[PDB]
Amino acid sequence: MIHFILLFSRQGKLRLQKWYITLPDKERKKITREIVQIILSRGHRTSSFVDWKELKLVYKRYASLYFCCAIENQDNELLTLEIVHRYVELLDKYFGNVCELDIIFNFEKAYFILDEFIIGGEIQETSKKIAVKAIEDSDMLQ
């Protein structure tokens, strides 16, 4: 299960955040700042995997904005990367040429998609079209 997911920009600004662990607000902010500093203080050949606080912090950003995750040391590492790629593809398909500008303005849609896709740090739908159809049906309800 993913302990937390944080979408942070290259400049350090965070565009998305979803933590599955009940932590204090000050503690959560400190953890986010430390993760941003570590990711921002990492090269392009770091393997996209960091063992921070006994958590497999996987960083894989496909654009200026980077992506982060917190997976416990009990599952495979490539699974997190595959899940991140699938989520990015689903968001791009739902939005259509998703860029950084649409992420800030359309944060609610991204949060709804993440909730409908991953719940409690675990996956909810393995397919990529069923989740999109469900999201579209929920949005069309008004």
Binding site: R10, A63, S64, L65, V88, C99
Partner: peptide, 10 residues
């Protein structure tokens, strides 16, 4: 800018 670019460019 660097923000209007697509996340995956697909």
């Amino acid at each position: 800018k660097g923000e209007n670019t697509s996340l995956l460019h697909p």
